[PDB]
Amino acid sequence: SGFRKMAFPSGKVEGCMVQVTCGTTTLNGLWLDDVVYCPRHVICTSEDMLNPNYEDLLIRKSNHNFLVQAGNVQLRVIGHSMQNCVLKLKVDTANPKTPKYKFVRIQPGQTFSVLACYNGSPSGVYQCAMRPNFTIKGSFLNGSCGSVGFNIDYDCVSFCYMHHMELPTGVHAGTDLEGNFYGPFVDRQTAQAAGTDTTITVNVLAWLYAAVINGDRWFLNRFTTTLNDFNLVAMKYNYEPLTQDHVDILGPLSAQTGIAVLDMCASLKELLQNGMNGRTILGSALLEDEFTPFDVVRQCSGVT
Amino acid sequence: SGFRKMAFPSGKVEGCMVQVTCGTTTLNGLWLDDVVYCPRHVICTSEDMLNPNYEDLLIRKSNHNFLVQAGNVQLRVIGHSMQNCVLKLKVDTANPKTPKYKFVRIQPGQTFSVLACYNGSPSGVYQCAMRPNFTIKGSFLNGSCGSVGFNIDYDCVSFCYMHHMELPTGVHAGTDLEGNFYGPFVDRQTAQAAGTDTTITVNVLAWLYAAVINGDRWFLNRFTTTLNDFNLVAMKYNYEPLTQDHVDILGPLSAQTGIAVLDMCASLKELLQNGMNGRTILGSALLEDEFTPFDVVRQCSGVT
Ligand SMILES: Cc1ccncc1NC(=O)[C@H]1[C@@H]2CCCC[C@@H]21
Ligand SMILES: Cc1ccncc1NC(=O)[C@H]1[C@@H]2CCCC[C@@H]21
């Protein structure tokens, strides 16, 4: 028992982190097989960053200008190419620590672990959600670009995020491993609107199920609701509308606890309308939306 | 910017996890050099656990009864001994992945990362505090015993905790790596009083400094207080009394922000007396005490 905001074990990802330097800029790279992936803005200088012409900036660079260091061993760069907002530096040595991996583009509302790095060295790991507006609320300082987000399924690491930017609001933006930004963002130092965000309803419900499983059950009530009625409340409180696909994914938790999904929705409706009244759920004084239903099932069953 | 409950990268610890089976019980072991450390209760059966006679139960066991498996390779046990509540199984092979390490006994109020494991396989990593009453509020299911807590200082892993028990209240208890319990706990299936707990004042103050550094500053006020006055409020609200040693450890954060420690204490006093008024600090609707002043400095400076 107990329920914590748990990150995946980061070892397989730690073995892939490298430092990439181009000119005056240093950031992190991900070394998988004989390729090192990193944000393309490693090629920018201070004067470039308002609106860099990446194609022109890259044309001034040769393989020998990309300094790649894996711990303390230097990698030989034998090719370079830009794909969307990432650079792919071909190296002459395959990473001996390359885990089984995939590149995946996650959906908004899904969760993943971030291994924050500086100078190719891991600093820490934390779990977060991709917001419905495609931003993440992480912990990133200058030099953390190139740090990656991932999930692990047995021995396979699915890389889903590479960090590129901190918006002027302090929230974070980045790309999948093919260099496509999540959201409307571009890799320039400009104020950029992040869409209206919402709370991830299916995750809050999954977390209320994790709370009942672990003994926090004060919020259960004698009520029920419908998807229609619940969605009027979700609308008022800026929660994602709940669909039958969300109800379906909550099936295992509903089956385990015996609490029908719409009955849990009625508990969530009452919490939205009345607040916590100075109480906590799983050590939180707010409704937590950074656990998916899969995360709850995995944590509650001790999956490795 | 951004501030997250970050765990240390777990790779160095993942390389030390093994599975230990004795009879019908399987749990985790920590393989460092040629020794595997695990909870002594791996030698118990269901009928033993109310009050096991560990010395007698261990006398029935030989080296060949301790099955130690590191991933998929079997380790040969050439010695066994019980030290307090841990078993030390001498193996014929030194762990090639043994990091630089220390065994440390942490103080209540200090934080550490836990690598939750089942069957010698890592499941996840999370950061937590050792409560002032020597319990931890973790995420542990049956089979997680032997999972360890640790801190990392550059290349050195300081192991501080090994998981042994879930109290009937759902909170967790364990030992240092010499097998001495933190707190009054014994490794028996009995109801055991955990002392009155308190909130870790110096950590809440450190976290308010992390909040100001990251832009959440609505809680700053025009007031100041004294240690005496603050401690009367700390008393009322079950917070640890603040000492000059705590004020001293907050020095770097006070110097960086320019907010005197007693002025931050006056903000904390007002938050204790008035609550958050439906607002949040660093995404939390309660006063967070799981970040030490060292954690805040490390996270805010990007230490690797
Ligand atoms: C400095 C920093 C801090 C944290 N996370 C990320 C960053 N980096 C950025 O925001 C870079 C974005 C793309 C290229 C142009 C310059 C700025
Ligand atoms: C079952 C479990 C679940 C989570 N964390 C820990 C445990 N294990 C225990 O509580 C064991 C304590 C010491 C020896 C006697 C039996 C019980």
Among B99, B127, B150, the domain boundary falls at B99
The experimental method is X-ray
The secondary structure of residue B177, as a DSSP letter, is T
Closest-approach residue (CA) in chain B for A8: B124
Do both A141 and A212 map to the same domain? no
Q: How many CB atoms lie within 10 A of CB B178?
A: 14
A300 included as an active-site residue: no
Ligand 1 centroid to Cα of residue B139, in Å, is 35
Nearest one of B160, B119, B111 to B141, comparing CA atoms? B119
Do both B117 and B255 map to the same domain? no
∠ CA A167-A172-A178, nearest 5°, is 110
∠ CA A116-A44-A130, nearest 5°, is 35
User: Which of the ligands is closest to the CA of residue B52?
Assistant: 2
SS3 B159: strand
CATH for A260 = 1.10.1840.10
Kindly state whether B48 is in contact with chain A, defined as any CB-CB distance less than 8 angstroms: no
In sign, the C-alpha dihedral spanning B32, A4, B144, B112 is: positive
Do both A216 and A297 map to the same domain? yes
Q: Is A193 left (phi over 0), alpha (psi -120 to 50) or beta?
A: beta
A266: Cα within 13 Å, side-chain hemisphere: 11
Both tokens assigned to B252: 């770097």
Go through B278-290 and write b for each residue having 16 or more CB atoms within 10 A of its CB, e for each that does not. Answer: eeebbbbbbbbbb
Both tokens assigned to B276: 């958050």
Residue A284, phi then psi, degrees to nearest 5: -110, 140
Q: How many CB pairs under 8 A join A and B?
A: 151
SS3 A274: helix
A145 included as an active-site residue: yes
Identify whether the C-beta of residue B165 lies closer than 8 Å to the C-beta of residue B174.
yes
Identify whether the C-beta of residue A109 lies closer than 8 Å to the C-beta of residue A130.
yes
Nearest one of B115, B84, B89 to B22, comparing CA atoms? B89
Tell me the one-letter amino acid at B135.
Answer: T
Measure in Å the smallest separation between the Cα of B286 and chain A Cα atoms: 6
Interchain pair B4, A128: CB under 8 A: yes
Measure in Å the smallest separation between the Cα of B125 and chain A Cα atoms: 5
Measure in Å the smallest separation between the Cα of A54 and chain B Cα atoms: 26
CATH for B127 = 2.40.10.10
Task: Tell me the β-bridge partners of B19.
Answer: B28, B69
Cα A213 from Cα A217, distance rounded (Å)? 8
Length of chain A: 304
Interchain pair B9, A123: CB under 8 A: yes
Determine the structural domain holding residue A167 and report its residue range: 1-14+100-197
172-201 of B, contacting A, C-beta below 8 A: 172
Closest-approach residue (CA) in chain B for A283: B286
Do both A83 and A115 map to the same domain? no
Pocket test for ligand 1, best of A38, A50, A145 (most atoms within 8 A of CB): A145
Place of tokens 């960090």: A163
C-alpha distance from residue B196 to each of A64, B111, B131, B132, B230 (Å): 62, 19, 10, 9, 20
Ligand 2 centroid to Cα of residue A155, in Å, is 28
Secondary element (H or E) of residue B21: strand B17-22
Do both A234 and A182 map to the same domain? no
Ligand 1 atom nearest residue A52's Cα: 15
- With a CB cutoff of 8 Å and minimum separation 6, the contacts of A106 are A112, A130, A151, A160, A161, A176, A182
User: Which of the ligands is closest to the CA of residue B190?
Assistant: 2
Ligand 1 centroid to Cα of residue A295, in Å, is 30
Do both B30 and B114 map to the same domain? no
Do both B216 and B292 map to the same domain? yes
In sign, the C-alpha dihedral spanning B215, B216, B222, B228 is: negative
Interchain pair A9, B143: CB under 8 A: no
C-alpha distance from residue B28 to each of A72, A116, B69, B112, B128 (Å): 33, 28, 10, 19, 20
Task: Tell me the β-bridge partners of A27.
Answer: A20
Do both A9 and A117 map to the same domain? yes
Residue B229, phi then psi, degrees to nearest 5: -65, -45
Resolution in Å equals 1.3
Cα B131 from Cα B200, distance rounded (Å)? 8
Measure in Å the smallest separation between the Cα of B3 and chain A Cα atoms: 5
Q: How many CB atoms lie within 10 A of CB A143?
A: 19
Identify whether the C-beta of residue A274 lies closer than 8 Å to the C-beta of residue A231.
no
Do both A119 and A226 map to the same domain? no
Cα B273 from Cα B269, distance rounded (Å)? 6
Interchain pair B11, A122: CB under 8 A: yes
Identify whether the C-beta of residue A149 lies closer than 8 Å to the C-beta of residue A114.
yes
Q: Write the burial class of residue A144 (CB in 10 Å: 0-12 exposed, 13-18 middle, 19+ buried).
A: buried
Identify whether the C-beta of residue B19 lies closer than 8 Å to the C-beta of residue B68.
yes
In sign, the C-alpha dihedral spanning A239, A125, B206, B108 is: positive
Do both B144 and B243 map to the same domain? no
Kindly state whether B125 is in contact with chain A, defined as any CB-CB distance less than 8 angstroms: yes
Cα B304 from Cα B299, distance rounded (Å)? 9
Tell me the one-letter amino acid at A122.
Answer: P
Kindly state whether B215 is in contact with chain A, defined as any CB-CB distance less than 8 angstroms: yes
Nearest one of A190, A40, A29 to A95, comparing CA atoms? A29
- With a CB cutoff of 8 Å and minimum separation 6, the contacts of B77 are B36, B63, B64, B66, B68, B89, B90, B91
Both tokens assigned to A68: 């790649």
SS3 A192: coil
Do both A10 and A113 map to the same domain? yes
∠ CA B272-A170-B252, nearest 5°, is 55
Tell me the one-letter amino acid at A191.
Answer: A
Cα A140 from Cα A170, distance rounded (Å)? 9
- Give the residue, by CA position, lying nearest to ligand 2 atom 1: B142
Among B70, B99, B128, the domain boundary falls at B99
Identify whether the C-beta of residue B161 lies closer than 8 Å to the C-beta of residue B148.
yes
Among A99, A120, A140, the domain boundary falls at A99
How many domains does chain B divide into? 3
Both tokens assigned to A246: 């969300």
Cα A30 from Cα A33, distance rounded (Å)? 10
Do both A2 and A128 map to the same domain? yes
